């Protein structure tokens, strides 16, 4: 009889069959495969060397000699030329596999890029048909100017990382050095978002209050009141006096540490508001919401300056927004793994850094905008080529636990990662340094202090906790 | 399919191998043979339907069949068959050499034959020259 091995494709003098597949093999090959992988090579069923049935029928007849195969040296010559073609074939396969994975990424990308277009037009068609179905009878330019240096200029000053920044061996001693209680009312406690400015900090409560707080003194600085629902996002202004906060009551209210009342209010959203961010000039507020809209306004006069629907015709969770101090090339995160950088003059996307299937809770640029990090509760965190719109590095873990917040350090050389638990990485080496389990519940917001020497956190454990070494 | 049944002799489309036989059958043949006789047609061992596995080809990863005639296994095979022939050839030559070399060593009488000729001729001379 005649048989060919499924692994090698050659004739075999020792045909054998696994009990867990129909395919037949040369015994010494499948045994060597089993000795590595313990599995059927084709069905991937678990396989052991005793589950092999042997065909005692006579193996394939010998291949006739070539006339050049009639002499021993010419067999060795033929064996050499045969061997070279076999190795070139094996080398061609690993090249072809690399090319196939390049093209698969690009087609899925081009497929997922087309789905961005289908989604916009389908809702815009739907809103057009809905009308029929119910028919009854400027600083941005200076931001471009600043972007026309700072996205390319900042090598001129950022020549080195700071010398006083924590070394990888030092941050390994991180421990919960303070614990804070009584920041918010005990009838409906909880802290859902956090921001800091040096040792000053600002807290959003489940009790529908915003509290200015000092996490070094363990002291309330000021309590701001006027929201009708619990807080969803906050920003603390570098002036140490102004504060901005966003709530489930669909409004944004601006406060001053001198005042018990609103410095300004933005009434600009259709549903609960989700995130806010500050222009690097300080005068202007940038905002996003669960209604699929984003809005941008002047803080210093209260005037709204531009607003657009990201995609109208559906209530879809935008859940992050940021400003980038070159002037532009910043973006928003939204429900269906959107991470869209915005062509702010044209009300359309400019770039993207998705890395997830699930929504993205936070987006942070580095000082010079040649690093960015993103993460999501589908269980990974990744570092991003702001300069070229590609992936660079990945953090991965066994459990794929929820990740609730992220933060660079002061410089972008460390990155805190966590949610159900907390860890910190030294990004300049890209190695894990320490694991922190002193929280008794999920973390909701993260900041780092100067030189990475401290870490500030809020949690569902009904406390605010600070880590340092 | 390329499998030929051992019992019907046809190229089968339902290839099945039985663990006791190590041999290839049609499914439609072996099930009724088990039903009517419970026995492997080849070895006359017992059979039961759990001892039967059905063959397949062309699954994912299954290498393309080499048809170029040359292969590394087949060249190493025939280089091995050359080597066995040359050693058994060389062994019989070595045996032949030992036999020939043995007897020509035992046959080394020729100097002792020469002394007998000397002894005979000297006797002859003294027996010829006495008158």
């Amino acid at each position: 009889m005649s048989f060919v091995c499924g692994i090698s494709g050659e004739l075999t003098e020792d045909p054998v069959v696994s009990q867990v597949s129909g395919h037949i093999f040369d015994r010494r090959l499948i045994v060597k495969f089993i000795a590595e992988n313990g599995t059927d090579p084709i069905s991937h069923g678990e396989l052991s060397e005793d589950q092999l049935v042997s065909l005692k029928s006579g193996g394939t007849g010998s291949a006739p000699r070539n006339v050049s195969g009639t002499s021993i040296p010419s067999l060795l010559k033929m064996l050499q030329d045969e061997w070279d073609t076999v190795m070139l074939n094996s080398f061609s396969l690993r090249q072809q596999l690399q090319i196939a994975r390049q093209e698969l990424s690009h087609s899925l990308y081009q497929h997922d890029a087309a789905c961005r277009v289908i989604s916009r037009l389908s809702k815009e068609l739907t809103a057009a048909r809905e009308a029929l179905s119910t028919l009854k009878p400027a600083i941005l330019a200076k931001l471009e100017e600043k972007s026309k240096s700072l996205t390319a200029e900042r090598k001129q000053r950022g020549k080195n990382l700071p010398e006083g920044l924590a070394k990888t061996e030092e941050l390994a001693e991180l421990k919960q050095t303070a614990s804070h209680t009584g920041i918010h009312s005990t009838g409906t406690p909880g802290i859902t978002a956090l921001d800091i400015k040096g040792n000053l900090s600002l807290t959003g409560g489940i009790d529908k209050t915003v509290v200015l707080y000092d996490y070094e003194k363990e002291q309330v600085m000021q309590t701001f009141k006027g929201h009708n629902k619990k807080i969803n996002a906050v920003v603390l202004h570098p002036d140490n006096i102004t504060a901005i906060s966003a709530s489930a009551d669909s409004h944004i209210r601006v406060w001053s540490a001198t005042d018990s009342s609103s410095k300004a209010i933005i009434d600009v959203h259709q549903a609960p508001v989700t995130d806010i961010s500050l222009n690097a000039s300080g005068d202007y507020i940038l905002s996003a919401s669960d209604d699929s809209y984003w809005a941008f306004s002047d803080i210093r006069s209260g005037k709204s300056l531009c607003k657009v629907s990201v995609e109208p015709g559906s209530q879809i969770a935008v859940h992050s927004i940021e400003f980038h101090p070159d002037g532009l090339i910043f973006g928003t995160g939204a429900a269906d793994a959107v991470v869209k950088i915005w062509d702010l003059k044209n009300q359309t996307v400019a770039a993207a850094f998705p890395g997830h299937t699930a929504a993205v809770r936070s987006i942070a640029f580095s000082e010079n905008g040649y690093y960015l990090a993103t993460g999501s509760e589908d269980g990974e965190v990744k570092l991003w080529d702001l300069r070229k719109l590609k992936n660079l590095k990945t953090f991965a873990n066994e459990e794929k636990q929820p990740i609730n917040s992220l933060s660079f350090d002061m410089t972008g050389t460390f990155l805190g990662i966590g949610g159900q638990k907390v860890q910190v990485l030294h990004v300049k080496s890209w190695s894990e340094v320490v694991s922190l389990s002193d929280h008794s519940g999920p973390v909701t917001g993260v900041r780092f202090g100067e030189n990475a020497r401290s870490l500030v956190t809020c949690s569902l454990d009904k406390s605010l906790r600070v880590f340092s070494f | 399919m390329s499998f030929v049944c051992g019992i019907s002799g046809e190229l089968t489309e339902d290839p099945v191998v039985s663990q006791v036989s190590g041999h290839i059958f049609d499914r439609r043949l072996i099930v009724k043979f088990i039903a009517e006789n419970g026995t492997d047609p080849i070895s006359h061992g017992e059979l039961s339907e759990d001892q039967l596995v059905s063959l397949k080809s062309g699954g994912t990863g299954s290498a393309p069949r080499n048809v170029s005639g040359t292969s590394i296994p087949s060249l190493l095979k025939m280089l091995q068959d050359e080597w066995d022939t040359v050693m058994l050839n060389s062994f019989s030559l070595r045996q032949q050499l030992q036999i020939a070399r043995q007897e020509l060593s035992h046959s080394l009488y020729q100097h002792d034959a020469a002394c007998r000729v000397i002894s005979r001729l000297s006797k002859e001379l003294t027996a010829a020259r006495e008158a």
């Binding site: 000699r65 | 025939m78 066995d84």
Partner: peptide, 24 residues
């Protein structure tokens, strides 16, 4: 060991000689 296929030569010669020849 190499030309063991000569069994197939005689078999195909035998099968060929079964043409224009008797039962069994």
């Amino acid at each position: 060991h190499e030309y063991g296929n000569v069994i197939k030569k005689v078999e195909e010669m035998k099968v060929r000689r079964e043409n224009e020849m008797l039962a069994l």
